Design a protein around this ligand. Structure first.
Ligand SMILES: [Mg+2]
Ligand SMILES: [Mg+2]
Ligand SMILES: [Mg+2]
Ligand SMILES: [Mg+2]
Ligand SMILES: [Mg+2]
Ligand SMILES: [Mg+2]
Ligand SMILES: [Mg+2]
Ligand SMILES: [Mg+2]
Ligand SMILES: [Mg+2]
Ligand SMILES: [Mg+2]
Ligand SMILES: [Mg+2]
Ligand SMILES: [Mg+2]
Ligand SMILES: [Mg+2]
Ligand SMILES: [Mg+2]
Ligand SMILES: [Mg+2]
Ligand SMILES: [Mg+2]
Ligand SMILES: [Mg+2]
Ligand SMILES: [Mg+2]
Ligand SMILES: [Mg+2]
Ligand SMILES: [Mg+2]
Ligand SMILES: [Mg+2]
Ligand SMILES: [Mg+2]
Ligand SMILES: [Mg+2]
Ligand SMILES: [Mg+2]
Ligand SMILES: [Mg+2]
Ligand SMILES: [Mg+2]
Ligand SMILES: [Mg+2]
Ligand SMILES: [Mg+2]
Ligand SMILES: [Mg+2]
Ligand SMILES: [Mg+2]
Ligand SMILES: [Mg+2]
Ligand SMILES: [Mg+2]
Ligand SMILES: [Mg+2]
Ligand SMILES: [Mg+2]
Ligand SMILES: [Mg+2]
Ligand SMILES: [Mg+2]
Ligand SMILES: [Mg+2]
Ligand SMILES: [Mg+2]
Ligand SMILES: [Mg+2]
Ligand SMILES: [Mg+2]
Ligand SMILES: [Mg+2]
Ligand SMILES: [Mg+2]
Ligand SMILES: [Mg+2]
Ligand SMILES: [Mg+2]
Ligand SMILES: [Mg+2]
Ligand SMILES: [Mg+2]
Ligand SMILES: [Mg+2]
Ligand SMILES: [Mg+2]
Ligand SMILES: [Mg+2]
Ligand SMILES: [Mg+2]
Ligand SMILES: [Mg+2]
Ligand SMILES: [Mg+2]
Ligand SMILES: [Mg+2]
Ligand SMILES: [Mg+2]
Ligand SMILES: [Mg+2]
Ligand SMILES: [Mg+2]
Ligand SMILES: [Mg+2]
Ligand SMILES: [Mg+2]
Ligand SMILES: [Mg+2]
Ligand SMILES: [Mg+2]
Ligand SMILES: [Mg+2]
Ligand SMILES: [Mg+2]
Ligand SMILES: [Mg+2]
Ligand SMILES: [Mg+2]
Ligand SMILES: [Mg+2]
Ligand SMILES: [Mg+2]
Ligand SMILES: [Mg+2]
Ligand SMILES: [Mg+2]
Ligand SMILES: [Mg+2]
Ligand SMILES: [Mg+2]
Ligand SMILES: [Mg+2]
Ligand SMILES: [Mg+2]
Ligand SMILES: [Mg+2]
Ligand SMILES: [Mg+2]
Ligand SMILES: [Mg+2]
Ligand SMILES: [Mg+2]
Ligand SMILES: [Mg+2]
Ligand SMILES: [Mg+2]
Ligand SMILES: [Mg+2]
Ligand SMILES: [Mg+2]
Ligand SMILES: [Mg+2]
Ligand SMILES: [Mg+2]
Ligand SMILES: [Mg+2]
Ligand SMILES: [Mg+2]
Ligand SMILES: [Mg+2]
Ligand SMILES: [Mg+2]
Ligand SMILES: [Mg+2]
Ligand SMILES: [Mg+2]
Ligand SMILES: [Mg+2]
Ligand SMILES: [Mg+2]
Ligand SMILES: [Mg+2]
Ligand SMILES: [Mg+2]
Ligand SMILES: [Mg+2]
Ligand SMILES: [Mg+2]
Ligand SMILES: [Mg+2]
Ligand SMILES: [Mg+2]
Ligand SMILES: [Mg+2]
Ligand SMILES: [Mg+2]
Ligand SMILES: [Mg+2]
Ligand SMILES: [Mg+2]
Ligand SMILES: [Mg+2]
Ligand SMILES: [Mg+2]
Ligand SMILES: [Mg+2]
Ligand SMILES: [Mg+2]
Ligand SMILES: [Mg+2]
Ligand SMILES: [Mg+2]
Ligand SMILES: [Mg+2]
Ligand SMILES: [Mg+2]
Ligand SMILES: [Mg+2]
Ligand SMILES: [Mg+2]
Ligand SMILES: [Mg+2]
Ligand SMILES: [Mg+2]
Ligand SMILES: [Mg+2]
Ligand SMILES: [Mg+2]
Ligand SMILES: [Mg+2]
Ligand SMILES: [Mg+2]
Ligand SMILES: [Mg+2]
Ligand SMILES: [Mg+2]
Ligand SMILES: [Mg+2]
Ligand SMILES: [Mg+2]
Ligand SMILES: [Mg+2]
Ligand SMILES: [Mg+2]
Ligand SMILES: [Mg+2]
Ligand SMILES: [Mg+2]
Ligand SMILES: [Mg+2]
Ligand SMILES: [Mg+2]
Ligand SMILES: [Mg+2]
Ligand SMILES: [Mg+2]
Ligand SMILES: [Mg+2]
Ligand SMILES: [Mg+2]
Ligand SMILES: [Mg+2]
Ligand SMILES: [Mg+2]
Ligand SMILES: [Mg+2]
Ligand SMILES: [Mg+2]
Ligand SMILES: [Mg+2]
Ligand SMILES: [Mg+2]
Ligand SMILES: [Mg+2]
Ligand SMILES: [Mg+2]
Ligand SMILES: [Mg+2]
Ligand SMILES: [Mg+2]
Ligand SMILES: [Mg+2]
Ligand SMILES: [Mg+2]
Ligand SMILES: [Mg+2]
Ligand SMILES: [Mg+2]
Ligand SMILES: [Mg+2]
Ligand SMILES: [Mg+2]
Ligand SMILES: [Mg+2]
Ligand SMILES: [Mg+2]
Ligand SMILES: [Mg+2]
Ligand SMILES: [Mg+2]
Ligand SMILES: [Mg+2]
Ligand SMILES: [Mg+2]
Ligand SMILES: [Mg+2]
Ligand SMILES: [Mg+2]
Ligand SMILES: [Mg+2]
Ligand SMILES: [Mg+2]
Ligand SMILES: [Mg+2]
Ligand SMILES: [Mg+2]
Ligand SMILES: [Mg+2]
Ligand SMILES: [Mg+2]
Ligand SMILES: [Mg+2]
Ligand SMILES: [Mg+2]
Ligand SMILES: [Mg+2]
Ligand SMILES: [Mg+2]
Ligand SMILES: [Mg+2]
Ligand SMILES: [Mg+2]
Ligand SMILES: [Mg+2]
Ligand SMILES: [Mg+2]
Ligand SMILES: [Mg+2]
Ligand SMILES: [Mg+2]
Ligand SMILES: [Mg+2]
Ligand SMILES: [Mg+2]
Ligand SMILES: [Mg+2]
Ligand SMILES: [Mg+2]
Ligand SMILES: [Mg+2]
Ligand SMILES: [Mg+2]
Ligand SMILES: [Mg+2]
Ligand SMILES: [Mg+2]
Ligand SMILES: [Mg+2]
Ligand SMILES: [Mg+2]
Ligand SMILES: [Mg+2]
Ligand SMILES: [Mg+2]
Ligand SMILES: [Mg+2]
Ligand SMILES: [Mg+2]
Ligand SMILES: [Mg+2]
Ligand SMILES: [Mg+2]
Ligand SMILES: [Mg+2]
Ligand SMILES: [Mg+2]
Ligand SMILES: [Mg+2]
Ligand SMILES: [Mg+2]
Ligand SMILES: [Mg+2]
Ligand SMILES: [Mg+2]
Ligand SMILES: [Mg+2]
Ligand SMILES: [Mg+2]
Ligand SMILES: [Mg+2]
Ligand SMILES: [Mg+2]
Ligand SMILES: [Mg+2]
Ligand SMILES: [Mg+2]
Ligand SMILES: [Mg+2]
Ligand SMILES: [Mg+2]
Ligand SMILES: [Mg+2]
Ligand SMILES: [Mg+2]
Ligand SMILES: [Mg+2]
Ligand SMILES: [Mg+2]
Ligand SMILES: [Mg+2]
Ligand SMILES: [Mg+2]
Ligand SMILES: [Mg+2]
Lengths: 187, 134, 59, 76, 98
RNA sequence: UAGCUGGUUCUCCCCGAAAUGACUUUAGGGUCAGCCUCAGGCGCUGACUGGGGCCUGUAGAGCACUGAUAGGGCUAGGGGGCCCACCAGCCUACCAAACCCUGUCAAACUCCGAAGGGUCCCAGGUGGAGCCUGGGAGUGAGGGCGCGAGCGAUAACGUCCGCGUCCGAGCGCGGGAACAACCGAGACCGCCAGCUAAGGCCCCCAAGUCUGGGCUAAGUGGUAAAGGAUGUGGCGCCGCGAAGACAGCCUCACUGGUCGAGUGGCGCCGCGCCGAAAAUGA
RNA sequence: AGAGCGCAAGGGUAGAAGGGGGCCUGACUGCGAGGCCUGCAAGCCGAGCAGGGGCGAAAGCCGGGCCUAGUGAACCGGUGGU
RNA sequence: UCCCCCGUGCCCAUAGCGGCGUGGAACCACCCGUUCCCAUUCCGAACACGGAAGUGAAACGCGCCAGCGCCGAUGGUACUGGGCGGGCGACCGCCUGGGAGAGUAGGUCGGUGCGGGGG
């Protein structure tokens, strides 16, 4: 995903927001600079890119950079982004979150139940060259009560997790139910 | 609970912290007006959802009533209200995420959450899960 | 740092004691009253303080 | 209503700030424990009251793991 | 265990710091409040014989020579982690003669 | 006797409070301090502001301590699925200490921490500033408003403190229909002069039925909520379509039919609608 | 450092104020610069001087207790002394 | 002037935990012995004395790795002197000056004063 950017300065951050432009910053151990982008454009892009997929920033400097969305400060009270960060990549193994795909109906969910996908993505230390669009996970062997962990992942080539190996990824759990209210009504 | 004693009242300053982001389910109910939500409200709202989609997915309550609510026995003007008639409530500023569902479709989630809105003493909005995760 | 022409154009009635003093500090007593004081960090301070009820110009 | 009760509030605190002139004997800090420690020309009494040992200016200092100290750098 | 060092300091001046190795002993009068040494009469690591205590009293008087020459007198003795006795004591015994 | 009530008589000029703290068989009374006044002395110090140094733990935030806390994972103690009882573990749509992940809460919790506040030094500051000594006091029911908290029911023209303000003493003047404290503003006297403030400029009533551009169709405006609706403009995205689409021609879809070119769903904003029952005449 | 520090909470504290031992009785006399707090009266801190002592080799420390509660003007009288 | 070690003070975790490696000439420790000084609620563990043989294992010094710990911007927001505007309200918005906490990027296996000894 590519998206047009522009350099910012003393311009009142608030003022920009009226003009539909949302401020932000791009940075890495080498450089950082004020910027901003058209909100609606960013919205449409970030709706798929988020922090998983890479993002090329087109600055009027003709420069185009391999930035990653580091964080997005939201305004509480009717959620809505205030200001965006951009981690301009390089080549060294920079860690980052990578999405997941819990494929296959679990033993529990099929036989009545519900899968609570804990982590929808996993933080991993990987070279910018390897940007695995996702990681597969056979969440089919999970009967109700079961649970998968990070130590049980389809780790792709050149990739390695940077979280806890014993961390939980997801789990099947009992379903809400009216019959439970009768028993809860007793106690 | 367990804790210790009856609380002072305190104002409800701006929605500063009062507010979050979906983090457990596919949809969420969020407060727009600030208010103390009674325990018995949480309850009715919660059951209203399970009662709806019977044998449903999973409900997530994300606010817990830890504030002691006081009240006088219909008298004059001294001592502090033993109260607790409503017992306990949780302060809730605008933008704070209350409930989250999961393991159900749109119609299941939309309707069920919407029902909770009518159980709550607040104007509320439903939320998807946009794409915003910090 | 030339000079400041200050004019009290809004009554301090209902304003804080300190702001009233700030006027006495400048030398403004009557309303609509002209007053030129040399531009200094100590004077500008009190001028900036009663800013909402005086209006300034450079001389 | 077993409450509604308290105790005469003791006006304690830093009684002389850094960059103030003090005569010998002047009390510098009345404190609960050793929220401040003595130092150059500053002794403390049985209650923890830090006081000047000679005339001079009072200067504060901090030393992290070692705590904060009050001094009296004399000159007269 | 250096609690003693703290006491001696907030008390006066001119610390007679005294270190002593299994085969050595050193002494240096230092004016704190700035951290500088005035005189340093090292011992076994200087020239002296072989009997520890006998050596101590020598260096003690030795320190006094060079020290008192420069005009010194504050006998603020830094009895290090060592209990005041024998070698360290003799070291004092010395300055208490010179 | 009356720590209570009432009454207390000529004029002009200057200044001008208090309704707080402490103690009080004290609580509508007193004593000392605070605040007013007069005289004498001191003489740039005073409020306020600039620069600098130190002190601080509130707003906010945070979970490192004290505790609270939903979900999950993991695992001592309870119940066990396959059963195995004189034994066992992955694990159980079973109760849970400790710990871990996710996510939160607190006046009497703080790893953090402002704005600000206090004080000192230097500087500006000659003001019904300031300091010292004395003579004379009154005041010690306060109130409203803004703000920060407690109490209360996130009730009261409620109550109790804190900072400020005004009324008190400015029920003198202009506005708010009328209205101590809301907006403007501090009335020495005179004038059939001028300029502005707030608020206004259709008539009552001084001043534009002013100019340019929108919105509203309710008398909204002319003062109510959750909530509800093809009210009405503005904005945006998502589905079908001249490969003929949307309605109705039993039809929706769709082709020949044909108006054939728009149509269906959602979301955001402005103004409005319903929700909306009271006692003398509107 | 979440223990301890006689007791409530707090602040403080292992670079001791906590625990153990040796010797000792400054839980001294006569004073007291300078201050904290303060309407008054009270309350609190205190270097230092003199006298005669304690512990330490010494620098030094000791005018009770880690500190903040554990209290009562005057009047009237008892007791011991001058 | 430069390097190494020893004693000491300052900054007070970017100085720490851990892991690996390195130094015994000197220094230091460890170490040998318990007669003398001194010591154990018992023990020469500790304090102490007299000292060779041995060792660098322990401890310590020096040097590497960022797993934990620790430090941590910029940007934005909260909050807020002061000045305003909006609703019945629980509240909300603007101007102006100040400006966090968290989190991100990153940093960090220290720095330095004095004295002594050795090359
Ligand atoms: Mg909505
Ligand atoms: Mg996370
Ligand atoms: Mg978070
Ligand atoms: Mg006014
Ligand atoms: Mg005033
Ligand atoms: Mg006039
Ligand atoms: Mg004139
Ligand atoms: Mg009680
Ligand atoms: Mg009280
Ligand atoms: Mg009180
Ligand atoms: Mg003093
Ligand atoms: Mg003392
Ligand atoms: Mg004491
Ligand atoms: Mg300083
Ligand atoms: Mg330290
Ligand atoms: Mg030593
Ligand atoms: Mg009387
Ligand atoms: Mg009468
Ligand atoms: Mg008159
Ligand atoms: Mg006259
Ligand atoms: Mg008159
Ligand atoms: Mg007069
Ligand atoms: Mg009163
Ligand atoms: Mg009293
Ligand atoms: Mg009294
Ligand atoms: Mg009274
Ligand atoms: Mg009376
Ligand atoms: Mg009086
Ligand atoms: Mg007063
Ligand atoms: Mg005269
Ligand atoms: Mg003069
Ligand atoms: Mg002056
Ligand atoms: Mg100043
Ligand atoms: Mg300043
Ligand atoms: Mg400055
Ligand atoms: Mg703090
Ligand atoms: Mg507070
Ligand atoms: Mg708070
Ligand atoms: Mg937390
Ligand atoms: Mg916690
Ligand atoms: Mg802690
Ligand atoms: Mg605590
Ligand atoms: Mg906890
Ligand atoms: Mg939960
Ligand atoms: Mg739980
Ligand atoms: Mg559960
Ligand atoms: Mg569970
Ligand atoms: Mg079984
Ligand atoms: Mg059974
Ligand atoms: Mg059996
Ligand atoms: Mg059997
Ligand atoms: Mg058996
Ligand atoms: Mg048996
Ligand atoms: Mg058996
Ligand atoms: Mg059996
Ligand atoms: Mg059997
Ligand atoms: Mg049996
Ligand atoms: Mg458990
Ligand atoms: Mg549970
Ligand atoms: Mg736990
Ligand atoms: Mg509170
Ligand atoms: Mg408590
Ligand atoms: Mg803190
Ligand atoms: Mg910080
Ligand atoms: Mg500050
Ligand atoms: Mg400050
Ligand atoms: Mg200042
Ligand atoms: Mg001066
Ligand atoms: Mg001056
Ligand atoms: Mg003059
Ligand atoms: Mg004068
Ligand atoms: Mg006056
Ligand atoms: Mg006046
Ligand atoms: Mg003066
Ligand atoms: Mg006087
Ligand atoms: Mg007088
Ligand atoms: Mg008088
Ligand atoms: Mg009087
Ligand atoms: Mg009073
Ligand atoms: Mg009253
Ligand atoms: Mg009264
Ligand atoms: Mg008042
Ligand atoms: Mg008032
Ligand atoms: Mg008020
Ligand atoms: Mg206010
Ligand atoms: Mg509060
Ligand atoms: Mg409230
Ligand atoms: Mg009300
Ligand atoms: Mg109130
Ligand atoms: Mg208060
Ligand atoms: Mg007045
Ligand atoms: Mg009138
Ligand atoms: Mg009248
Ligand atoms: Mg009027
Ligand atoms: Mg009026
Ligand atoms: Mg009036
Ligand atoms: Mg009036
Ligand atoms: Mg007037
Ligand atoms: Mg006249
Ligand atoms: Mg006139
Ligand atoms: Mg005329
Ligand atoms: Mg004019
Ligand atoms: Mg004009
Ligand atoms: Mg007209
Ligand atoms: Mg009329
Ligand atoms: Mg007219
Ligand atoms: Mg018109
Ligand atoms: Mg028009
Ligand atoms: Mg109508
Ligand atoms: Mg009504
Ligand atoms: Mg209406
Ligand atoms: Mg209402
Ligand atoms: Mg409401
Ligand atoms: Mg409404
Ligand atoms: Mg409405
Ligand atoms: Mg609707
Ligand atoms: Mg209509
Ligand atoms: Mg429309
Ligand atoms: Mg269709
Ligand atoms: Mg067909
Ligand atoms: Mg047609
Ligand atoms: Mg749709
Ligand atoms: Mg929208
Ligand atoms: Mg109607
Ligand atoms: Mg009717
Ligand atoms: Mg009617
Ligand atoms: Mg600890
Ligand atoms: Mg403790
Ligand atoms: Mg103990
Ligand atoms: Mg406790
Ligand atoms: Mg404590
Ligand atoms: Mg300490
Ligand atoms: Mg001790
Ligand atoms: Mg002990
Ligand atoms: Mg002891
Ligand atoms: Mg003993
Ligand atoms: Mg003892
Ligand atoms: Mg014994
Ligand atoms: Mg004297
Ligand atoms: Mg005095
Ligand atoms: Mg005195
Ligand atoms: Mg004072
Ligand atoms: Mg007094
Ligand atoms: Mg008196
Ligand atoms: Mg007195
Ligand atoms: Mg007392
Ligand atoms: Mg003394
Ligand atoms: Mg003696
Ligand atoms: Mg000596
Ligand atoms: Mg003493
Ligand atoms: Mg003592
Ligand atoms: Mg004790
Ligand atoms: Mg003791
Ligand atoms: Mg008493
Ligand atoms: Mg008694
Ligand atoms: Mg008593
Ligand atoms: Mg008496
Ligand atoms: Mg009597
Ligand atoms: Mg008698
Ligand atoms: Mg007698
Ligand atoms: Mg040379
Ligand atoms: Mg040379
Ligand atoms: Mg040099
Ligand atoms: Mg060099
Ligand atoms: Mg060194
Ligand atoms: Mg130094
Ligand atoms: Mg270790
Ligand atoms: Mg080696
Ligand atoms: Mg080797
Ligand atoms: Mg060797
Ligand atoms: Mg042997
Ligand atoms: Mg022998
Ligand atoms: Mg023998
Ligand atoms: Mg023992
Ligand atoms: Mg023994
Ligand atoms: Mg041995
Ligand atoms: Mg030894
Ligand atoms: Mg040897
Ligand atoms: Mg050897
Ligand atoms: Mg080694
Ligand atoms: Mg080894
Ligand atoms: Mg190294
Ligand atoms: Mg090292
Ligand atoms: Mg490493
Ligand atoms: Mg890391
Ligand atoms: Mg910058
Ligand atoms: Mg910043
Ligand atoms: Mg900013
Ligand atoms: Mg502001
Ligand atoms: Mg309105
Ligand atoms: Mg309401
Ligand atoms: Mg309000
Ligand atoms: Mg600013
Ligand atoms: Mg800054
Ligand atoms: Mg800061
Ligand atoms: Mg944060
Ligand atoms: Mg967090
Ligand atoms: Mg950033
Ligand atoms: Mg190291
Ligand atoms: Mg470093
Ligand atoms: Mg480095
Ligand atoms: Mg460095
Ligand atoms: Mg150096
Ligand atoms: Mg050298
Ligand atoms: Mg050497
Ligand atoms: Mg050489
Ligand atoms: Mg060479």
């Amino acid at each position: 995903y590519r998206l047009k950017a522009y350099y910012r300065e003393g311009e009142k951050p608030s003022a920009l927001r009226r003009a539909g432009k949302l401020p932000g910053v791009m940075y890495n151990r080498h450089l950082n600079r004020k910027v901003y982008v058209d909100l609606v454009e960013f919205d449409k892009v970030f709706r798929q890119a988020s922090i998983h997929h890479v993002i090329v920033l087109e600055l009027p400097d003709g420069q185009s950079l391999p930035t990653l969305v580091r964080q997005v400060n939201l305004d509480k009270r009717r959620r809505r982004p205030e200001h965006v960060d951009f981690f301009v990549l390089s080549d060294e193994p920079v860690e980052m979150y990578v999405p997941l795909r819990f494929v296959g109906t679990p033993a529990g969910v099929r036989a009545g139940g519900v899968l609570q996908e804990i982590h929808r993505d996993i933080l991993v230390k990987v070279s910018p060259r390897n940007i695995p669009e996702f990681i597969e996970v056979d969440v089919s062997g999970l009967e109700i009560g079961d649970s998968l962990h990070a130590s049980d992942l389809k780790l792709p080539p050149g990739v390695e997790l940077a979280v806890s190996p014993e961390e939980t990824i997801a789990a099947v759990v009992p379903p809400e139910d009216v019959e439970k209210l009768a028993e809860e009504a007793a106690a | 609970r367990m804790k210790y004693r009856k609380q002072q009242r305190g104002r409800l300053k701006g929605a500063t912290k009062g507010g979050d982001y979906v983090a457990f389910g596919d949809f969420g109910l969020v407060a727009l007006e600030p208010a103390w939500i009674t325990a018995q409200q949480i309850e009715a709202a919660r059951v209203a959802m399970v009662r709806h989609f019977r044998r449903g997915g999973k409900i997530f309550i994300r606010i817990f009533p830890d504030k002691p609510y006081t009240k006088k026995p219909l008298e004059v003007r001294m001592g502090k209200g033993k109260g607790n008639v409503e017992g306990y409530v949780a302060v809730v500023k605008p933008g704070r995420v209350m409930f989250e569902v999961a393991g159900v479709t749109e119609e299941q989630a939309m309707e069920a959450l919407r029902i909770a809105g009518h159980k709550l003493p607040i104007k509320t909005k439903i939320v998807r899960r946009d794409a915003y995760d910090e | 740092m030339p000079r400041l022409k200050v004019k009290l154009v809004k009554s301090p009635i209902g304003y804080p004691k300190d702001q009233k003093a700030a006027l006495k500090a400048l030398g403004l007593r009557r309303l609509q009253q002209e007053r030129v004081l040399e531009d200094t960090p100590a004077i500008r301070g009190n001028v900036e303080k009663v800013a909402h009820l005086v209006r300034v110009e450079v001389v | 209503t077993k409450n509604g009760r308290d105790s005469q509030a003791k006006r304690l605190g830093v009684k002389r700030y850094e960059g103030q002139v003090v005569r010998a004997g002047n009390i510098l800090v009345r404190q609960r424990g050793t929220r401040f420690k003595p130092g150059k020309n500053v002794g403390m009494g049985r209650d923890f009251t830090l006081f000047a040992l000679v005339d001079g200016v009072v200067e504060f200092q901090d030393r992290g793991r070692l705590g904060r100290y009050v001094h009296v750098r004399p000159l007269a | 265990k250096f609690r003693v060092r703290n006491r001696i300091k907030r008390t006066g001046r001119l610390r007679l710091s005294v270190f002593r190795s299994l085969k050595h002993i050193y002494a240096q009068i230092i004016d704190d409040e700035k951290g500088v040494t005035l005189v340093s009469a090292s011992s076994l690591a200087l020239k002296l014989k072989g009997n520890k205590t006998e050596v101590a009293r020598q260096v003690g008087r030795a320190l006094a020579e060079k020290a008192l020459a420069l005009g010194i007198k504050q006998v603020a003795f830094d009895r290090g982690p060592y209990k005041y006795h024998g070698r360290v004591k003799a070291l004092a015994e010395g300055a208490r003669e010179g």
